[PDB]
Subunit: 455 residues, 3 copies
């Protein structure tokens, strides 16, 4: 009979509800369908990203290693399952010694020889008190923990691919907007050079208009470098090259993603993968306590074989040479120097170590979901304010264009208004990128994109 | 006999004094009470911070794992100490074999069965030359390194909780100043809207007063998220949530911490816990060299038991069946093919690796303490030059307020000085937060808070 | 015989050429001399940096651990190589037991005290099918992987030392320009104080002049702190202190690094050390399959000894007590419970894991070299624009100095032009530092400085 104690899951050391305050919105309560059960095909609505994630889900190498670890742990589980059964083997022996006359039976030094081949098992421990079954269950729980870790690696890879793709999508728009600002500065320098060549401006204004262009083209260079260094960072995450037959993507202002229900915090114990990984490692540490307890109890070993024995090698195949052996053995320790007790304390300590690691994983998940809820609460007001700033800059540019077309303002004032519009659009692009990255990280922290479609 | 070499502590490859220069102050020499002897209750002068650290030293799970690891290594040391004793047990054996008619002693095939219940040991290695004692000493030193690791984890947790609390305390005042800047901008927009509706201001001055207001609103919405996102970071480090009945904390302008003596570079060898951990690992490797040395010498084992044996089953514990067995064994390897010398060389290489890691731990501790001393040397004049800036900006604000009260300037010019006051106060708050974070990290680097009060 | 499968190096899962776009130059094709064959002495053309590397390569404690791990794994290889030879040792025995009246040959309880002193081998497994040979090959391949890891650590240390020294060289020039800016601000404050004393200006201008000098005293302190905290990191990387007999260094405007050719990605498989380390790990995992295949085949163990056996204690000297024993045995498993097949599957899975890790090492090296080439293609135009900006600011300042020498402008405007000149001159230093850091990292990713001279 077994000796593994009864497993009881520890309570969550978090608050009962997600945090409130000025940053957070109202709590939605329970979830009809959780964010884990929502597949990543319905979450990401950009069809270019839906193909890039599909490329990265079988061309990546971290996901491939995390997939192969599950097979590596099944191969370790089958080994530990195999030790309950006896190891039937063929064992051929030979012995040739020369005892002296004192120790030999004939009172004379004579060379004695015995040979024989048997079929049978040696030292086959009969798992009566549940030791080898406890090690089997420990290996099975470690396999389940690896199976959860593969899903966690897939969710991390999906959120990383979406983050890098949105980063490239933002930096290309930044490059185009800086390419417009450089042309504005170039036109302003051309008008200042004309005004200096006719004799109305001095060299002091020509040098300032030169410094503006020479400061803009350095920004153009250091944004071209960023576009290339994000293309390389996406190519490394994909595992292969970027596919050529890709569908046309969406702009940053469109609704790229779908909102997900946060749900209750107690759902995080049921859906997030690494919490389940820590729980299964806790169950393995629990199953080790049975193997530590069974060392006190008696162990039963067995040795049994049957075959042919003879004096010389020629008498092996002959009839009448049948032989068998049957050796049972029981063993019970009485006095160890506190050895088995200290091993039992070692198992009981590592169970509490896994309890503490499980609780720390729950607390980390709660913290990085509350951060995403704070970001979702505040980024709506932040982007509404930035979009109103962009609209007011557009109205200022249209009014400056009316004063230019009428004839009151020269062209340098209109060029001064264009880059003031472009700065406001650049800041909007950066804030929208931060809003999308926080939502992608919230989707990873809530259970992630393990399923492809919704269940 | 013992073959462990005489342990010698290696010299620290650092300079004899803390570095000088125009960033550092002047070295004070020796220290009557070094920083490890100063507890964290008399160091942090905030009564709220002390209660938060009192919560964190009980509820944080990362400290709990390190508090269980020392007991795990204690159990491992007890297991390795238990090897110096014979394992006494009850062995109930049995044997029933059928042999052919030539190897049997009668020339006829028969069954030679016996049974026996004995009590005693087997393979008890008599530690004469000190192999198992050297392994016991290695387990003892590996136990002694783990409580130094626990002390280092406690110092790191104390510095992390203090840094997170000061970051929260600074970010709340940053939010409080951002709200006032937005309240300034809203009045400056309402006055421009009134002046536009009256007829004096064009619609090119309304739009830029609108863009200023939206630029303030976006900063408010991104500081609220920061306050929430480091409230969650404090809650994660505290283990449990923030308590409700808290004392009244101190503002950033007051003396929040205590000045601490730097001391000498030769004190880091005595008081910083990770250097003592790296030293005890070196003592463990020096102990393992003795266990590798003992393999060249003859090993002595013993097998001795006493019990009752019989030919058939029913006559086991009946009288006239007492028996013993005594077996000494001596082994000395003559020709291992360079195996034992390779194991000895491997032990020496492990000792040299621990030497190099010990010296690297000393060098990194010196680098951290010298960074903290440089920052302590320069932040005093940095914050002096920063407080003079806020004093001059406040004098500018009061002179502009006198001009407004007299009737020379309008209410649009006074608000442009109030914003400069707010900008200078925000920069002062940021520099003060940097000064306090550097002093908390300097307190950690010198030996940290492991004691609670002064010793 | 040997059961190790044939090793086939996998294909590079990268593109056949480095990427091309707006940020890259032209692909120079194959390199007649590679980047890994260029020594670091010829690459770093600064006579101070060469001496700093010639100190750091001897005094660093990470390179010492990496250069001792190759000796540890050489000893671990020699241990496994020693297991092919039989262990020849002397064995002293002895047995005293009182069998009961049933199991003794006399019919009465007899005491059978025998002894023996012999020399020979026990349990010597004959490696006919290549199990221990494949284990020796696995240990040899892991030794070669550690050999590659040492060179990878040396290249990383060289790149870190060069980056830290160039950062110190940049920050000292930043200190000098900040001192010049502070002197300009102090002269402006003295002129404004004099104009306030005569009565031309008001206190409203004196406070604004005071704020600008406090803002420079607050920056001088933090740049002094940056220079000290960077010197401490350089002394940490060097191991020992900075030597006093340093030769004269060079400025950042002078050409410090030799241009290295990029070559082809197919050279990355040949000369980067952390690709060869992942290759030798794969060869070790390939030898592990030959180690796992040999479990299905018969193992031939041997015991063989010769010496003097006797009954009394005094019989071990004289003749007539000699003895030998020769005991061969073969074992062949027939039925296991899927244990050997699971171990073979585990070996194949551990081969495929190292296949995936080798491909990921190739992809990481490709991404790093591609980022370095994207930096090299853009930093030329960025630095050209920045030094043209510095030249235009110098011409503007010289025209302002002409207007001051003539009599039109006062000293307040001439001093105002110098601050813009210093701002451009210290943006150029940051851009030059970023270019040199990217070039050092591109040299490290291409194969790095393993050799001192050109090979």
């Amino acid at each position: 009979c077994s000796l593994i104690p009864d497993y009881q899951r520890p309570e969550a050391p978090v608050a009962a509800a997600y945090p409130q305050g000025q940053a957070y919105g109202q709590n939605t309560g329970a979830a009809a369908v959780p964010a884990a059960d929502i597949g990543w095909r319905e979450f990401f609505r950009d069809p270019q990203l839906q193909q890039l994630i599909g490329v990265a889900l079988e061309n990546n190498r971290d996901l491939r290693v995390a997939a192969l670890n599950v097979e590596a742990f099944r191969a370790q589980y089958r080994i530990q399952r195999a030790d309950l059964f006896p190891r039937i083997g063929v064992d051929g022996s030979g012995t040739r010694q020369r005892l002296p006359g004192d120790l030999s039976t004939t009172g004379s030094p004579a060379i004695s020889s015995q040979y024989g081949v048997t079929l049978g098992t040696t030292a086959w421990e009969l798992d009566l008190f549940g030791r080898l079954r406890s090690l089997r269950d420990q290996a099975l729980e470690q396999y389940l923990a690896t199976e959860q870790a593969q899903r966690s690696a897939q969710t991390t890879l999906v959120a990383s691919v979406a983050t890098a793709y949105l980063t490239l999508k933002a930096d290309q728009a930044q490059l185009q907007l800086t390419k417009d600002t450089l042309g504005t500065y170039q036109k302003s320098f051309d008008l200042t050079q004309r005004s200096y060549d006719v004799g109305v401006a001095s060299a002091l204004d020509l040098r300032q208009a030169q410094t503006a262009v020479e400061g803009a083209r350095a920004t153009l260079a250091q944004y071209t470098r960023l576009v290339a260094q994000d293309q390389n960072a996406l190519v490394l995450l994909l595992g292969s090259g970027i596919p050529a037959n890709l569908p046309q993507g969406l702009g940053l202002d469109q609704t790229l993603l779908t909102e997900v229900p946060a749900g209750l915090p107690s759902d995080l114990l049921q859906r997030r993968p690494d919490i389940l990984e820590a729980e299964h490692q806790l169950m393995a540490a629990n199953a080790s306590i049975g193997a530590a307890r069974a060392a006190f109890f008696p162990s039963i070993s067995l040795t049994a074989n049957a075959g042919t024995m003879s004096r010389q090698l020629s008498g092996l195949f002959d009839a009448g040479s049948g032989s068998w052996l049957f050796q049972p053995s029981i063993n019970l320790p009485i006095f160890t120097a506190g050895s088995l007790r200290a091993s039992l304390d070692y198992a009981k300590i590592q169970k509490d170590i896994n309890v503490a690691q499980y609780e720390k994983a729950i607390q980390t998940a709660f913290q990085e979901v509350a951060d995403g809820l704070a970001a979702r609460g505040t980024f709506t007001e932040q982007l509404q304010a930035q979009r109103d700033l962009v609209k007011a800059s557009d109205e200022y540019y249209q009014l400056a264009d009316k004063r230019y077309r009428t004839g009151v303002d020269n062209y340098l004032t209109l060029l001064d208004a264009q880059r003031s519009l472009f700065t406001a659009q650049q800041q909007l692009i950066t804030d929208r990128l931060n809003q999308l990255t926080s939502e992608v990280n919230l989707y990873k922290a809530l259970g992630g994109g393990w399923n492809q479609q919704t269940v």
